Amino acid sequence: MNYTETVAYIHSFPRLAKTGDHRRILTLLHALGNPQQQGRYIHVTGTNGKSTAANAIAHVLEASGLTVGLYTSPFIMRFNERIMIDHEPIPDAALVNAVAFVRAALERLQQQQADFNVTEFEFITALGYWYFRQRQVDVAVIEVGIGGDTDSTNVITPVVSVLTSVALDHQKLLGHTITAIAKHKAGIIKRGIPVVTGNLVPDAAAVVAAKVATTGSQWLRFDRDFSVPKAKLHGWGQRFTYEDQDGRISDLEVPLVGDYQQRNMAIAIQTAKVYAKQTEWPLTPQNIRQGLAASHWPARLEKISDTPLIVIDGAHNPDGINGLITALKQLFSQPITVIAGILMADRLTAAFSTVYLVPVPGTPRALRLKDSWQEALAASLNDVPDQPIVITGSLYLASAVRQTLLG
């Protein structure tokens, strides 16, 4: 298969029944030489903040001199972006060969037990572990698909575990209460392995405390063991101070606006430090500083254009958006145009001057109106050229706009 047929092949996998075990992925991983048992890993999960922390952890460790593998849910919708090494998406040619290798193994298996198969995420996940082990990265930062305990990635013993936060976003698949969802996340907490978490809501905190009591895991929690005593807007991003048991790292600078992000940055820092300490690896404040300064955040209050001033954001859920409104008030003091394509609609119309509501690209249109972000964009630029435009609402839109306007 060529690159295109390869990606199509990955998306053709069946929606196999959910189960508590990892037998399917394990059977495939076994046929791949169990690459998940080798090397080092940092396991990350959380309702929100998961990808932000994981990305930051990677940049920090990369700046310290390590080759870091990263398995994530990208905002840019190109498949290759899910598996990276030192933030470089897996090359098309390498994906084609990797897919071929895993397929051959898959076909040998089906030759043994005719009914054998895996889901798409299990296939991709097994392939990711294999890839990282093949390239022999120093460590692979792994983001749980969703939940944790029964997630396809949950087949490793990491150096550190990370639980950013617990919320009801994915309640449909993980549970009706914070406790039930929390029990899924706590599943990535392992015996003797440290766990770094944000300042979890009571029920989530109670579930973690009981879990670490059984695992014996050292528990470092945001706003208890480490925190951010200072944080303020600084140009298109912010300057903040990190503090923990060892002291402070003053005025770090990351190009990521959004008061909520300092919590994910601190989590990342603390996690990187735990990793280094657990592996006798050097990590300096200069390394931390360098990693955050060079970090990149596609679709997060990203100013993809200065003149005209265009901003793209992935704010989708009612919480990620209300937070966005808060960020825009800090960044802009002038009238702006907001183009929104959602899957929160009154919090925008009531917050900003001009607001266009368009459909989300590549999605059914169910039952301020424009037939597309492009029409909304052209109308605003034609009516008021000097007026900044913020495009948000979903994720498919963000990458649609980003891809169209960036290449």
Task: State the DSSP string of 162-210.
Answer: EE----STTHHHH-SSHHHHHHHHGGG--TT--EEE----HHHHHHHHH
Total of domains in the chain? 2
Helices first, then strands: H and E counts in the chain: 14, 16
Residues with Cβ within 8 Å of 158's Cβ and at least 6 positions away in sequence, in order, are: 40, 41, 42, 43, 142, 188, 190, 193
Examine the domain organization and report whether 25 and 111 are in the same domain: yes
Closest CA to 301 of 288, 315, 289: 315
Kind of pairing, strands 139-143 and 41-45? parallel
Q: 155 and 186: one domain?
A: yes
Q: Give CA separation, 52 vs 55, 75, 270, in Å.
A: 5, 11, 14
User: How buried is residue 118: exposed, middle or buried, by Cβ count under 10 Å (0-12/13-18/19+)?
Assistant: buried
Rounded distance between C-alpha atoms, residue 70 and residue 140, angstroms: 6
**Of the candidates 77, 169, 124, which has an alpha carbon nearest to the alpha carbon of residue 362?**
77
Give the CA distances from residue 226 to residues 63, 84, 111, 215, 257, in Å, rounded to whole numbers and listed in that order. Answer: 21, 29, 52, 21, 20
| Distance in angstroms (rounded) separating the CA atoms of residues 77 and 58 | 20
Q: Are residues 353 and 222 in the same domain?
A: no
The token pair at 220 is 């470092």
> What experimental approach yielded this model?
X-ray
* 3-class secondary structure, 322: helix
Amino acid at 65: G
Distance from chain centroid for Cα 190: 21
- Looking at the structure, do residues 35 and 115 belong to the same domain, yes or no? yes
Q: Is 131 in the same domain as 212?
A: yes
Q: What does DSSP assign to residue 306?
A: E
134 burial (CB, 10 Å; 0-12 / 13-18 / 19+) is middle
Residues 250 and 338 in one domain: no
Question: Residue 354: which CATH number?
Answer: 3.90.190.20
318 lies in which domain range?
299-407
Measured distance CA(157)–CA(141) in Å, rounded: 12
Single out the residue in 281, 298, 315 at which a domain terminates. 298
Strands (E), 215-369: 219-221, 226-233, 238-244, 247-254, 302-306, 309-312, 337-340, 354-357
| C-alpha dist (Å) from residue 141 to 120, 212, 362, 379 | 20, 21, 30, 43
Other beta carbons less than 10 A from residue 305's beta carbon:
14
**Residue listed under structure tokens 């907490």:** 189
Distance CA 129, CA 76 (A): 22
CB 201 within 8 A of CB 166: yes
Could you give the CA distance from residue 166 to residue 296 in angstroms, rounded to a whole number?
A: 25
